């Protein structure tokens, strides 16, 4: 596809404007921390270990987020939200990230670029990535969208 | 009092062995994070703000802990537990900290050194501190205790 338009913009300003030869990651699941799960770990914690836990979780999440960079990807389109700090990590890692991409677009992009839409970020092997000549921010009218061109 | 023995040891190894001219802080309350309170802030949080919160809390607590160093104190005897990371902060700040000091000892030390046992760590003015010539770790038999000598 010498074109697929996504009506969603890259999440951070400090993110790349154009991405040449993009390996694209497709995640079904939100790049976020599960409330119920960390509340419970806080609840079952030894009172003197509360901060240890919050710190171990700050590391565990950042690691979950780095599995994108480590799988080689330089573009990530998430079907759901992306935690704000997670958005920071990717902006630093220089990755083009998009959140809340419609399910239809996720599938449309899956076929077009050849990626496999994962949910569990551990199955994020560099084989499930998609490819495209360029991925760019584009502003039509007052919408900031993302063009996925040269779909391979 | 050319002597008050406390049957509790300084909390960390990297803490001072002897503290000359000690201004002593007495806290009724635990130097810990309240479970119920942070669980609720996690629960009411925008999903994309979970990590922002955990980070703001990591700072808020460290600041609560620094109010000891900032009140001038160089010795803190807490009547309850002290969060492990909080114990790290004090060990770095070079403060002699003791946790779970008996209530009777807290009062006994209050009179002897002239400090005011606070609960709310904001009332930790340098006026509520106690004084003593030396505060030292001491090992009698197989107990590691704390001697508060030269109580002024
Ligand atoms: Na899907
Ligand atoms: Na008391």
Curated annotation (Swiss-Prot), chains A, B:
The N-terminus is blocked. Keywords: ATP-binding, Chaperone, Nucleotide-binding. One of its GO terms (molecular function) is ATP hydrolysis activity. The keyword Acetylation does not apply. Forms a Heterooligomeric complex of two stacked eight-membered rings. Molecular chaperone; binds unfolded polypeptides in vitro, and has a weak ATPase activity. Belongs to the TCP-1 chaperonin family. This is Thermosome subunit alpha. The chain holds residues 214 to 364 of 545 of the full protein.
């Amino acid at each position: 596809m010498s074109g697929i338009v996504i009506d969603k913009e890259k999440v951070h300003s400090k993110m790349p404007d154009v991405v040449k030869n993009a390996k694209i990651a497709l995640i079904d699941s939100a790049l976020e921390i599960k409330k119920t799960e960390i509340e419970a770990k806080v609840q079952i914690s030894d009172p003197s270990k509360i901060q240890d836990f919050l710190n171990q979780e700050t590391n565990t999440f950042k690691q979950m987020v780095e599995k994108i960079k480590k799988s080689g990807a330089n573009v990530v389109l998430c079907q759901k939200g992306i935690d704000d700090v997670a958005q920071h990590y990717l902006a630093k890692e220089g990755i083009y990230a998009v959140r809340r991409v419609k399910k239809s677009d996720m599938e449309k992009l899956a076929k077009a670029t050849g990626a496999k839409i994962v949910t569990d970020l551990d199955d994020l092997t560099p084989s499930v990535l998609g490819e495209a000549e360029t991925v760019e921010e584009r502003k039509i009218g007052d919408d900031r969208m993302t063009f996925v061109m040269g779909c391979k």
